[PDB]
Amino acid sequence: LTLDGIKDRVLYVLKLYDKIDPEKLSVNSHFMKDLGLDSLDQVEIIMAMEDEFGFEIPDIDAEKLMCPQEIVDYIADK
Amino acid sequence: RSRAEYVVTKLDDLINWARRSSLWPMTFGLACCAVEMMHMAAPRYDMDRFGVVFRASPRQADVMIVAGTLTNKMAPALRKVYDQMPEPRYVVSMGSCANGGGYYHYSYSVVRGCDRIVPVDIYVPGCPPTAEALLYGILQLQRKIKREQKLKIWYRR
Amino acid sequence: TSVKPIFSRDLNEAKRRVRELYRAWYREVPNTVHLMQLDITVKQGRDKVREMFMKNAHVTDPRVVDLLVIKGKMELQETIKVWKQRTHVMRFFHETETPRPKDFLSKFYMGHDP
Amino acid sequence: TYKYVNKKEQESEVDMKSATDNAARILMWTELIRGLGMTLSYLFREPATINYPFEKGPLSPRFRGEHALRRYPSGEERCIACKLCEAICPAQAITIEAEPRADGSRRTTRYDIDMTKCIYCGFCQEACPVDAIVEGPNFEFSTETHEELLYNKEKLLNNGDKWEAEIAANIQADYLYR
Amino acid sequence: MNLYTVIFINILLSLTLILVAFWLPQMNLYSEKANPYECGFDPTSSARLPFSMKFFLVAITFLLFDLEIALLLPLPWAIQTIKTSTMMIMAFILVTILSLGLAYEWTQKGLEWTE
Numbered sequence: 174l175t176l177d178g179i180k181d182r183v184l185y186v187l188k189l190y191d192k193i194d195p196e197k198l199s200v201n202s203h204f205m206k207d208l209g210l211d212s213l214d215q216v217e218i219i220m221a222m223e224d225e226f227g228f229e230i231p232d233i234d235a236e237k238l239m240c241p242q243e244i245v246d247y248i249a250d251k
Numbered sequence: 252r253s254r255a256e257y258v259v260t261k262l263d264d265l266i267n268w269a270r271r272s273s274l275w276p277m278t279f280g281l282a283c284c285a286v287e288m289m290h291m292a293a294p295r296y297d298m299d300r301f302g303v304v305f306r307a308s309p310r311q312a313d314v315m316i317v318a319g320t321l322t323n324k325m326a327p328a329l330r331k332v333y334d335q336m337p338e339p340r341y342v343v344s345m346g347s348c349a350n351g352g353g354y355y356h357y358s359y360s361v362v363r364g365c366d367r368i369v370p371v372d373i374y375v376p377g378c379p380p381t382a383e384a385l386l387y388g389i390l391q392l393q394r395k396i397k398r399e400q401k402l403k404i405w406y407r408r
Numbered sequence: 409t410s411v412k413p414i415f416s417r418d419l420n421e422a423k424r425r426v427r428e429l430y431r432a433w434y435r436e437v438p439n440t441v442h443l444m445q446l447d448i449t450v451k452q453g454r455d456k457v458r459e460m461f462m463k464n465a466h467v468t469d470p471r472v473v474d475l476l477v478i479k480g481k482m483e484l485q486e487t488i489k490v491w492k493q494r495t496h497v498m499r500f501f502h503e504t505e506t507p508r509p510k511d512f513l514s515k516f517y518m519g520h521d522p
Numbered sequence: 523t524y525k526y527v528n529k530k531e532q533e534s535e536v537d538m539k540s541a542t543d544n545a546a547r548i549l550m551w552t553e554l555i556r557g558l559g560m561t562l563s564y565l566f567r568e569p570a571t572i573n574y575p576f577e578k579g580p581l582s583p584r585f586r587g588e589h590a591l592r593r594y595p596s597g598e599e600r601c602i603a604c605k606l607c608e609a610i611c612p613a614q615a616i617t618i619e620a621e622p623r624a625d626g627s628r629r630t631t632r633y634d635i636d637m638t639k640c641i642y643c644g645f646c647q648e649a650c651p652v653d654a655i656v657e658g659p660n661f662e663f664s665t666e667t668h669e670e671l672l673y674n675k676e677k678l679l680n681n682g683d684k685w686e687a688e689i690a691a692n693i694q695a696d697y698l699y700r
Numbered sequence: 701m702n703l704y705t706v707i708f709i710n711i712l713l714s715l716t717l718i719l720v721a722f723w724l725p726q727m728n729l730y731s732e733k734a735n736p737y738e739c740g741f742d743p744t745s746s747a748r749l750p751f752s753m754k755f756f757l758v759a760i761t762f763l764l765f766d767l768e769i770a771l772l773l774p775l776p777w778a779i780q781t782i783k784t785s786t787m788m789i790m791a792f793i794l795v796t797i798l799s800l801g802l803a804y805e806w807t808q809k810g811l812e813w814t815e
């Protein structure tokens with residue numbers, strides 16, 4: 174649902190998030206393995222998506238969005 | 252000295268007398284010590300005949316009488332209402348609890364003397380001090396105010 | 409090693425509650441900074457929340473985690489209700505406390521305490 | 523046995539007389555007038571106020587006031603540093619040190635009372651075996667600093683020398699009750 | 701002229717007392733002193749939020765009853781009329797309908813405050 178337009182906004186959010194090195198950020202970069210974040214960092218990132226896309230992502234859903242891509246698939250499947 | 256210094260000194264007396272003669276304490280009491288404060292207002296001692304009138308608003312009060320134990324949970328609130336009294340303002344610490352923690356000095360929950368929170372002008376000992384002992388301390392505050400030399404000090408600056 | 413659970417049957421279920429409480433504290437910081445007129449940034453408030461959560465990152469017992477969350481929800485409640493005052497919230501930052509030095513030599517100079 | 527404070531509900535019929543008396547009471551505020559009568563009657567009563575500090579409230583020989591350390595009629599201190607007062611003090615307001623005096627006497631070198639810890643309970647003067655520490659009759663010793671209420675031995679002995687004439691007479695009046 | 705003169709003096713006296721009260725005393729402004737009072741704890745919200753009015757119906761009834769007395773205040777001039785019977789009937793009818801209006805609102809529980 175605006176599939177590529179969504180991706181433009183998602184990566185915008187992750188670049189603002191300081192803990193992510195902006196060069197290493199790619200649509201398939203796993204938050205834990207690649208970017209080297211931790212569990213609470215991920216929770217803040219999904220909360221940031223909750224702000225941009227204006228809807229509630231449950232704990233059960235948000236626990237899975239482990240790299241930028243699945244966020245996009247989750248959002249489009251709204 | 253000079254006639255300008257004499258005039259300044261007489262003005263100090265006049266403004267000092269006015270504040271001596273119209274001391275309005277906050278309606279503010281914490282524990283058993285406040286009961287003896289009621290007895291100072293009661294007919295036998297009638298604090299109002301000295302010009303002492305309780306007002307509930309800190310904006311309309313000159314004296315804080317810390318009449319009882321000051322707990323850690325109460326300390327910020329007491330500091331708030333002290334800060335909201337317009338100046339010139341005075342504090343009378345009444346009873347062992349307010350003076351230094353008293354019977355509860357060693358408690359985890361008690362401030363060991365209200366003079367860790369606010370400046371204190373008069374310390375009234377006792378647990379509780381009698382209504383008369385409190386009245387004596389109020390009259391000692393008046394004599395302290397009688398000694399203020401703010402205009403003389405301004406003149407000599 | 410057989411114990412009654414409190415709320416969570418395993419540390420994985422407990423971690424879920426921890427993340428919910430963290431979200432609630434994270435969203436509350438900007439409202440608290442604004443309503444209490446705290447002289448700190450929102451970023452500084454959220455860093456403090458993070459540091460308080462990581463003070464307990466080593467806990468593995470699901471029951472202890474359950475009780476840490478229960479207490480964390482209480483602290484959140486007295487913060488949202490403004491039962492805590494500014495003095496209470498600013499206590500988390502220890503702004504008048506000189507921290508104890510961590511090296512052997514500095515402690516040796518100061519006194520006898522380890 | 524019990525009584526009802528507000529069970530007067532024996533409902534009855536109303537005559538014209540009682541209905542008019544009820545009407546007069548409502549419309550002419552009669553019970554409110556009785557209230558004014560009471561406050562008027564106090565206006566013409568002599569007030570109970572005394573002219574402090576020229577007049578004083580009555581007290582009794584048992585009154586627990588400012589502490590003092592007493593002497594024997596010779597001038598020798600009564601306190602022999604037993605520390606019973608220190609042990610019993612419910613506020614731990616008493617601090618004592620002692621050693622043999624130059625003449626070998628058992629006497630204190632420290633006798634402190636934190637008057638801002640003390641609860642003025644009189645337990646020390648009950649516990650003293652030699653009537654050394656007493657609460658005297660003085661209650662007018664408010665200070666301008668906290669530090670002035672941390673009494674040491676010199677202060678407490680000066681209170682004894684200051685107030686012994688009244689302290690002795692109060693003990694003579696009450697000791698048979700002790 | 702005289703009424704203008706005395707009321708200006710009344711205004712002048714009040715404003716002078718305000719100026720004295722604000723410029724004579726020693727000041728000491730700091731944030732905790734000037735924060736709003738609420739019994740030693742901070743307010744949890746603005747005092748500017750809505751404050752419910754439980755007597756709102758009595759309040760707007762008062763608007764109508766205040767124009768009723770405006771219709772009654774010419775009565776001292778009206779009793780001078782030759783047409784005494786007409787004036788008396790008009791005044792009696794006016795007072796009676798206002799009473800009936802009050803009686804109706806009373807029996808409708810319009811004077812009871814909302815809960």
Ligand SMILES: CCCCCCCCCCCCO[C@@H]1O[C@H](CO)[C@@H](O[C@H]2O[C@H](CO)[C@@H](O)[C@H](O)[C@H]2O)[C@H](O)[C@H]1O
Nearest residue numbers: 338339722723724725726727728729730731732733734
């Ligand atoms: C064309 C422009 C002309 C130049 C203009 C310059 C304006 C500068 C104004 C300086 C402030 C004067 O205004 C006054 O300052 C004093 C002390 O300074 C403060 O007054 C009060 O508050 C402070 C708070 O600590 C106390 O220190 C002070 O003693 C007390 O009187 C207030 O702030 C104000 O009452």
Ligand SMILES: CCCCCCCCCCCCO[C@@H]1O[C@H](CO)[C@@H](O[C@H]2O[C@H](CO)[C@@H](O)[C@H](O)[C@H]2O)[C@H](O)[C@H]1O
Nearest residue numbers: 782783784785786787788789790791792793794796797
């Ligand atoms: C639904 C609402 C009901 C409430 C309203 C009821 C209004 C009815 C009013 C009835 C009373 C009228 O009362 C009436 O007063 C007038 C004067 O005012 C009297 O009139 C009398 O005096 C007047 C002078 O004023 C003479 O000029 C006249 O010839 C003579 O009759 C009448 O004799 C009397 O009947």
Ligand code: SF4
Nearest residue numbers: 283284346347348379
């Ligand atoms: S000093 Fe004594 S009387 Fe006063 S509040 Fe404390 S315990 Fe009560």
Ligand code: SF4
Nearest residue numbers: 611640641643644646
């Ligand atoms: S009066 Fe009571 S509290 Fe005070 S010193 Fe004696 S024993 Fe201690």
Ligand code: SF4
Nearest residue numbers: 601602604605607650
């Ligand atoms: S004052 Fe009395 S009880 Fe206390 S140490 Fe001296 S002798 Fe013993």
